[PDB]
Structures are given as C-alpha cells and as structure tokens.
Write a protein that binds this DNA or RNA. Structure first.
Lengths: 82, 82
RNA sequence: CGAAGCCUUCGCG
RNA sequence: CGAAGCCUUCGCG
RNA sequence: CGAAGCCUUCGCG
RNA sequence: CGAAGCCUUCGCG
C-alpha cells in the first residue's frame, strides 16, 4: 500500500485516498465541516473520514482544494503510521 | 473506561478525554482549526487529537465551548468503538 | 496533604 | 469491454 | 450544470 | 489580564 500511497500525494491525493478506501473495503467521506466568509472569498473547512477513522481538518479556498488538502492530510497520516 | 467515559459526556467532556489520554499514556491536543465571523459573533472550529488519533472537527461560539464540543465528539467516537 | 481538570461568578482592559 | 478519479480546456446558469 | 481532451486506477475478460 | 467559588479526577497518609 505504502508505495502507491506515496505516489498519490503529489499527483492526485483524492484518488489515492479512494484507492486506500476500496482496498480495505471502506467508504471514504469528505465532510464539509464549515463554510464561512463572503461569497467572493469564502473559506471552506473539510475533513476526510474512512470507515471509523477521522483525519486532520483543513482550511481551503475552494471545495475542490478542500477535498485535495483533506485527502493529502489523511495520506500523510497513513504513511506516518509505518 | 467506558463506564466513566459515559459519565463525562454529560458533565465534562474535556475532563473525560483527559482521563482517557492519561490512562492510555497519551497527550491530548485541541487544535484550533479555524476562526471566522465578525468579532461579536465569531465561529471557531476545533479538533481533538489523542496520541496519533484525530477526531471529528466541531463548530462552536467560544474557545472553551469549542474544546468541550471537540472532546464530546471524540468521546462519542470512542464509546462507539466498543 | 500534594496535584490536575472543568464550570461559575466578579472586577479590569 | 464496464466503471471510477485527477489534470486541463470550452460553454451554460 | 453541460461537454471534450488527457492521464491514473479499479472490475470483468 | 487579576481574583473568588464550586464540582470532578489522581496520587499520598
């Protein structure tokens, strides 16, 4: 797992986390924790969840980048574990 | 653990998480993920972390209530574990 | 006795 | 052959 | 929201 | 920021 997981951090973190989620029979989730700010400069706060494990919450400027950074944080956490 | 952990959900989640963290030799952290909103109506976003495990991020109106809500979520998860 | 944590109140900014 | 996901681009509200 | 291109991965062969 | 009060937990006697 670790090998491909490292690869996914640079190119496409969301894809790597979904891959991890499939290969362990788990459904991945990206929770929109919070939305704030004016419409032209909003701030989104996202959190990745896999099965029963929750990951670092992140601030981002767009929903896409919210998911990307949430995935990225989850991936770094999982790589750290071993 | 589960017995006392249930009790702390009503009275003081922050204390219960501190008990859990001590009794498994873990350092607890309450991360201020985000602050937003106007000065008289701020919104804070907190996340509890115990050792290497991160917990649901929560919204609250004050820092203390932020920590308490994060702790409460972590406790509900840990009771869920068994 | 020695600590730690929470909540509450009061004053100040 | 059948899915899914990123990258970029274009158009619509 | 509607598409195209390109990449990666999954699944059945 | 400076105090006060409560409750809870832990160790010791």
């Amino acid at each position: 797992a670790i090998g491909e997981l490292v690869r996914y951090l640079n190119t496409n973190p969301v894809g790597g986390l979904l891959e991890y989620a499939r290969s362990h029979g788990f459904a991945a989730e990206f929770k929109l924790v919070d939305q704030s700010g004016p419409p032209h400069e909003p701030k989104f706060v996202y959190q990745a969840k896999v099965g029963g494990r929750w990951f670092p919450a992140v601030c981002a400027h767009s929903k896409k980048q919210g998911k990307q950074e949430a995935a990225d944080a989850a991936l770094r956490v999982l790589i750290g574990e071993n």
